[PDB]
Design a protein around this ligand. Structure first.
Ligand SMILES: [Mg+2]
Ligand SMILES: [Mg+2]
Ligand SMILES: [Mg+2]
Ligand SMILES: [Mg+2]
Ligand SMILES: [Mg+2]
Ligand SMILES: [Mg+2]
Ligand SMILES: [Mg+2]
Ligand SMILES: [Mg+2]
Ligand SMILES: [Mg+2]
Ligand SMILES: [Mg+2]
Ligand SMILES: [Mg+2]
Ligand SMILES: [Mg+2]
Ligand SMILES: [Mg+2]
Ligand SMILES: [Mg+2]
Ligand SMILES: [Mg+2]
Ligand SMILES: [Mg+2]
Ligand SMILES: [Mg+2]
Ligand SMILES: [Mg+2]
Ligand SMILES: [Mg+2]
Ligand SMILES: [Mg+2]
Ligand SMILES: [Mg+2]
Ligand SMILES: [Mg+2]
Ligand SMILES: [Mg+2]
Ligand SMILES: [Mg+2]
Ligand SMILES: [Mg+2]
Ligand SMILES: [Mg+2]
Ligand SMILES: [Zn+2]
Lengths: 211, 156, 224
RNA sequence: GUAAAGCGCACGCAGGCGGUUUGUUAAGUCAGAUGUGAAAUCCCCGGGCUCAACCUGGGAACUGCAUCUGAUACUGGCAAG
RNA sequence: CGGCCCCCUGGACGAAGACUGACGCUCAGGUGCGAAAGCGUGGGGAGCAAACAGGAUUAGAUACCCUGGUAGUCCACGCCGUAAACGAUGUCGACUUGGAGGUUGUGCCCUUGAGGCGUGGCUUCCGGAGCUAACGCGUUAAGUCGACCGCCUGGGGAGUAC
């Protein structure tokens, strides 16, 4: 059967939101619209910086955006030039004084978004998928992950009938709310069709509530 | 330096309510080419792990064989299940004249000149079981001397 | 142990003539009241020669596993192992325990982790029911692996009480080449015991005699 | 036994086989010797066609048969148990 | 092969002793016996019951069910000679760990009814080695071996044609 979105259910227990501003119903909708379009713009512009999450927090007169990338030197380019450029850009979109403060991810193989998009980038380069997923899980657990499950669905190897293939290793206890299970979904558009990948990475129970 | 040898890889199946799932059984043989040889038979959902665990099992259970100069000491006819094997020592430089299963077992055990035939079923698993036990039943001259309380040249 | 020392304890006792095993004929003095009588003339020298080997093993830093699952004699065998700082199995034998050494290591690690966790803390972080459940699992694991938590590598010698009851253990040992020292009643099959002691295996007094003598010689072998 | 295959069961002639000891016989059996088993062909060592195929010298083999002389453990015959 | 009794008659087993002295095993052809159904002649025929008659059900019921009911079922004498005639396991002999029984002999010791030591015959169920494709067999072998006989050579055609 269907399964609840693992990140969406652990928001209260172990997962922080990705947009932590506050606003009453008067300007709630347009805040959402602005931040949606700005994060989609950033994704489209940093399709090579290998960004994992774009958290957005708004002071009353300002917009603050924190990027989580595996390649900090890339997004900041040379002497922080391009980051200032895109700061001007987000200033345009939000229509608001903007500030960008990048943040790095030390274990890029331990980021469901990162490993999922890597899997998709491999698939679109026409590589046998089983190799991709098993390499990903091996790398992840070699970097000391309590567990990881990878899942690919679609016309794998240009199959006329779409199949579902997954591979789990370690512990991935979705039902335990206390578990730090990072999850993300990516899609790869090939000539045959669009292939969907899902990644769960369990990094250990978090005893002691949210904080 | 243990010589290994894959000799059979079959795909077996088992039916379940949703569908019939498939597994692979690998029958392999291992031998130091110096009178020690074992055989392994592994099962796995896919062939490489199957042959891996088959060779692992074959690394244990390696029996000893009292050959001499890369050949047997006397004709031997081992029988296992529906397969009966007949092996006979041959002159120097004749080679391994045997079926593929028997040839694998023999050449990995280290015998160099022998004549073999396989009567009955040629099912490789039973064939290798038969020939391995038959090899285990050989009797070196000094073994006979011991169990008969005589000198070896007395038997010769 | 002297023949008189055994006889008073009752080492000469054996299972009914109705229930005996064929290979035990050489070790059987005779029958009385339809009861098999074990011959101490064979029992004493074999036990002494086994004590020699046990002293040798312990004097080369050997790890000794005392084995017995009798509900009467479990505590006796456990205390016997403690008196010589040796590992022990006093509860029902687990199938393939030596063969699945890798599997047991995870259980020992879990037992060590649970005891370490209780001392370290985080039980307060766990719910009171969860902390109690962790303690119950630790207690169950201690009841399961109290003797072999400090086993380290596979043992160097085995001492077995009622070898017929513990036949899985001896089959494993022979499969590993680990020597078996066992008290073998008339109903047992003596093939699996490399140093076989034919004697009563139920009576508390004779069992304690075996264990005490073995442990004295093991401490002696350790002392050097 | 269930894959092809124990007659439904029994008696019983011919036939096949036959407990144990001693003696004799030598039929079977074994050993030796002799005679014979055409040549070619097969095999081995050589020789001649420029090589080979082919031809060819010598040998080996022809595992058989027969006769005679012995052997007597085993089977057969005879006699006594 | 099943009430009881009488008359005639076959085999088996046990104890002890005597007797003969290989007189034995198997058996192609041959001979005999041989469930049920069936055939011939003649009796007998209560119950049961192919066929058949009828009533229901059903498209139909030519079946199952119901009401009847003939041959047959029984006896005498012949004939038939076939059955999943099966343990789907030919006969005879020898040897090979155990346990629980049933039945039928028989010896010794007991104070004996009892009871305990033994020793035979047949028979049942487990199970060791061993064997078997496996199932299973397992001292009553499907184990280990001898002697002789019968039988088999892919499935149909066909146990049919002549
Ligand atoms: Mg739901
Ligand atoms: Mg065949
Ligand atoms: Mg059939
Ligand atoms: Mg048949
Ligand atoms: Mg019959
Ligand atoms: Mg004779
Ligand atoms: Mg005759
Ligand atoms: Mg001659
Ligand atoms: Mg000629
Ligand atoms: Mg020439
Ligand atoms: Mg004679
Ligand atoms: Mg007389
Ligand atoms: Mg006949
Ligand atoms: Mg009739
Ligand atoms: Mg009539
Ligand atoms: Mg009439
Ligand atoms: Mg009627
Ligand atoms: Mg009608
Ligand atoms: Mg009459
Ligand atoms: Mg018939
Ligand atoms: Mg028949
Ligand atoms: Mg037979
Ligand atoms: Mg007969
Ligand atoms: Mg049985
Ligand atoms: Mg045909
Ligand atoms: Mg006909
Ligand atoms: Zn006991």
């Amino acid at each position: 059967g269907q399964k609840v979105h693992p990140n969406g259910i652990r928001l209260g227990i172990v997962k922080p939101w990705n947009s932590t501003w506050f606003a009453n119903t008067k300007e709630f909708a347009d805040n959402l619209d602005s931040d949606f379009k700005v994060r989609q713009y950033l994704t489209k512009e940093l399709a090579k910086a290998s960004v994992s999450r774009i958290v957005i927090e708004r002071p009353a007169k300002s917009i603050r955006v924190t990027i989580h990338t595996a390649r900090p030197g890339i997004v900041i380019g040379k002497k922080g030039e391009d980051v200032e450029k895109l700061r001007k850009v987000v200033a345009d979109i939000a229509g608001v004084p903007a500030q960008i403060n990048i943040a790095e991810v030390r274990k890029p193989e331990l980021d469901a978004k990162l490993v999922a998009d890597s899997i998709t980038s491999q698939l679109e380069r026409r590589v046998m998928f089983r190799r991709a997923m098993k390499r990903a899980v091996q790398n992840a657990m070699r970097l000391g992950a309590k567990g990881i499950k990878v899942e690919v669905s679609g016309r794998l190897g240009g199959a006329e009938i779409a199949r579902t293939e997954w591979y789990r290793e370690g512990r991935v206890p979705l039902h335990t709310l206390r578990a730090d299970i990072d999850y993300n979904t990516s899609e790869a558009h090939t000539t045959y069709g669009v292939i969907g990948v899902k990644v769960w990475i369990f990094k250990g129970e978090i005893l002691g509530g949210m904080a | 330096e243990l010589q290994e040898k894959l000799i059979a890889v079959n795909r077996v199946s088992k039916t379940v309510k949703g569908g019939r799932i498939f597994s692979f059984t690998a029958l392999t043989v291992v031998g130091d080419g110096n009178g020690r040889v074992g055989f392994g038979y592994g099962k796995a959902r896919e062939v490489p792990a199957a042959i891996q665990k088959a060779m692992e099992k074959a690394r244990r259970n390696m029996i000893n064989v009292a050959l001499n100069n890369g050949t047997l000491q006397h004709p031997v006819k081992g029988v296992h299940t529906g397969s009966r094997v007949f092996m006979q020592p041959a002159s120097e430089g004749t080679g391994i004249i045997a079926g593929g299963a028997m040839r694998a077992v023999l050449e990995v055990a280290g015998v160099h000149n022998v004549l073999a035939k396989a009567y009955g079923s040629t099912n490789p698993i039973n064939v290798v079981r038969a020939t391995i036990d038959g090899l285990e039943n050989m009797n070196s001259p000094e073994m006979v001397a011991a169990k008969r309380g005589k000198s070896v040249e007395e038997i010769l | 142990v002297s023949m008189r020392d055994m006889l008073k304890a009752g080492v000469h006792f054996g299972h009914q003539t109705r229930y005996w095993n064929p290979k035990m004929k050489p070790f059987i003095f005779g029958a009385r009241n339809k009861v098999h009588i074990i011959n101490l003339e064979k029992t004493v020298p074999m036990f002494n020669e086994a004590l020699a080997e046990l002293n040798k093993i312990a004097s080369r830093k050997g790890k000794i596993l005392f084995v017995g699952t009798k509900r009467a004699a479990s505590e006796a065998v456990k205390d016997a192992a403690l008196s010589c700082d040796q590992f022990f199995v006093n509860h029902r034998w687990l199938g393939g325990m030596l063969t699945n050494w890798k599997t047991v290591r995870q259980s020992i690690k879990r037992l060590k982790d649970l005891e370490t966790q209780s001392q370290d803390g985080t039980f307060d972080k766990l719910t009171k029911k969860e902390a109690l459940m962790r303690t119950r699992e630790l207690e169950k694991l201690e009841n399961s692996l109290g003797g072999i938590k400090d086993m380290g590598g596979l043992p160097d010698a085995l001492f077995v009480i009622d070898a017929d009851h513990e036949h899985i253990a001896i089959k494993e040992a022979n499969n590993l080449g680990i020597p078996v020292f066992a008290i073998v009643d008339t109903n047992s099959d003596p093939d699996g015991v490399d140093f076989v002691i034919p004697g009563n295996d139920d009576a508390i007094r004779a069992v304690t005699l075996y264990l005490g003598a073995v442990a004295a010689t093991v401490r002696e072998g350790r002392s050097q």
